[PDB]
Write an enzyme that holds these catalytic residues in place. Structure first.
Site, mmCIF file in Angstrom:
data_model
loop_
_atom_site.group_PDB
_atom_site.id
_atom_site.type_symbol
_atom_site.label_atom_id
_atom_site.label_comp_id
_atom_site.label_asym_id
_atom_site.label_seq_id
_atom_site.Cartn_x
_atom_site.Cartn_y
_atom_site.Cartn_z
ATOM 1 N N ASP B 17 0.594 -1.178 -0.006
ATOM 2 C CA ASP B 17 -0.082 -0.110 0.048
ATOM 3 C C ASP B 17 0.889 1.120 -0.083
ATOM 4 O OD1 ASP B 17 -1.968 1.885 0.366
ATOM 5 O OD2 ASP B 17 -2.901 0.925 1.833
ATOM 6 N N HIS B 34 3.722 3.878 -9.089
ATOM 7 C CA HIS B 34 3.538 2.460 -9.740
ATOM 8 C C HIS B 34 4.804 1.999 -9.939
ATOM 9 C CE1 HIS B 34 2.122 -1.258 -11.746
ATOM 10 N NE2 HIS B 34 2.713 -0.875 -12.858
ATOM 11 N N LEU B 128 12.983 -19.043 -3.297
ATOM 12 C CA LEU B 128 11.884 -18.414 -2.782
ATOM 13 C C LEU B 128 10.457 -18.226 -3.955
ATOM 14 C CD1 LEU B 128 10.599 -16.164 -1.191
ATOM 15 C CD2 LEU B 128 11.425 -14.487 -2.553
HETATM 16 MG MG MG Z 1 0.253 1.164 -8.459
#
Ligand code: MG
Ligand code: MG
Ligand code: MG
Ligand code: MG
Lengths: 231, 231
Positions: B17, B34, B128
């Site tokens: 977030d 982003h 992973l």
């Molecule tokens: Mg974004």
């Protein structure tokens, strides 16, 4: 700013953690913390009612060992029997309606009676719904609701196409209550420990540092203020 | 104390977030956040791998309006397409295995291809497991798993008696992974926003104040240290 009385959560859920720890710090057996915790329930129930909260779900759980929560789920000291017997008159007068969620069918006969009497005597109250989660677990709740919904569907000869989010909400033990806008847990431990896992999907979480026995009306207001500030 | 390399969580889940908020603070369109968020994924994936984390589930979600999470669930900017296309070579070399959970069947054809290519090219890696929750919701996951389990049972002509907690775990989209010991959410917002609601029943929660774009290897270590201190 200050407490906005027009934006008080309708439903607050609280994991009352810290009774054991509180007692241990004072070199006293857990029962001493259990008793003080009971006094906290009385304080919180009154203030919640006085500020406009409409539903208050309480989950008695004492973090003793972070890696062994199963020991708490069905432990006698997490029962509100003492609370209900000593505070029922007040609950009645305060227009508080007592309710429960969880698996209570296998509790001692005298325990079932105490709980049922509390419910019956407050069945007509229209104020705060005081909801005690007894011998409760979110996963167990879902498993149970899933089993019934299946039988309910097969019995009626239907397919799984009617099963949606709303359907599930209406088949949980909490079907009559809106999801809590706020979930509070005391003691500083930050887990929901299988409590209302489905219901708190969108709830705001507040992990208050005070042990349940020390948590009070002032602290509750502060939590709601935090809730309101975070928007 | 310091980071205990012998008590590193096997599975860490993170709600990434803050991308939108980060961009807005700098008067830039969300796309800038982003992009930076994508760089955070690269940093976190490498360090997680380097300290021994075995499963890392990432949920791209940007809190724009606290009261409208549905707008994020199926939003294009929460897709890891850009990340996978620009970092695949590194993932392959780092022995990272890419996987996904969520509803991807209705995503653009070119998006499904990019995701499938990423999986195929890393299908044999043994390090992973990088798990991206795409167009995912815990409630939707359960609803979906419940429908199938019902058909799977009726088709086989069986009753709901075999349905228990374990049964449900094995029918969720996360059936091949252990539940996360730690759930982290950045930006300071404290909700799980319908992410792995069943799976985080016992997880420790950490609400980190930094916006995802500013979150880094140092901060991750600090979160794990907090996790280890709380016991
Ligand atoms: Mg974004
Ligand atoms: Mg107690
Ligand atoms: Mg029904
Ligand atoms: Mg199966």
């Amino acid at each position: 700013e200050e407490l906005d009385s027009s934006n008080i959560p309708e439903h607050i859920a609280i994991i009352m953690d810290g009774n054991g720890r509180w007692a241990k710090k004072r070199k006293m057996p857990r029962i001493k913390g259990h008793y003080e915790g009971m006094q906290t329930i009385k304080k919180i129930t009154r203030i919640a009612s006085d500020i406009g909260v409409k539903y208050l779900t309480l989950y008695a759980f004492s973090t003793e060992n972070w890696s062994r929560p199963e020991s708490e789920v069905n432990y006698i000291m997490n029962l509100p029997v003492n609370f209900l017997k000593t505070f029922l008159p007040e609950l009645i007068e305060k227009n508080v309606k007592v309710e429960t969620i969880g698996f209570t069918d296998k509790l001692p006969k005298s325990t079932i009676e105490a709980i049922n009497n509390a419910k019956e005597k407050t069945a007509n109250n229209t104020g705060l719904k005081l909801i005690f989660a007894i011998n409760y677990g979110g996963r167990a709740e879902l498993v149970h609701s899933i089993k019934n919904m299946f039988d309910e569907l097969h019995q009626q000869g239907l397919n799984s196409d009617i099963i949606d989010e709303t359907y599930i909400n209406n088949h949980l033990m909490t079907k009559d209550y809106p999801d809590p806008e706020l979930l509070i847990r005391t003691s500083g431990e930050q887990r929901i420990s299988n409590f209302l896992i489905w219901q708190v999907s969108y709830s705001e979480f507040i992990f208050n540092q005070k042990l349940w026995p020390d948590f009070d009306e002032d602290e509750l207001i502060k939590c709601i203020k935090i809730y309101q500030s975070r928007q």
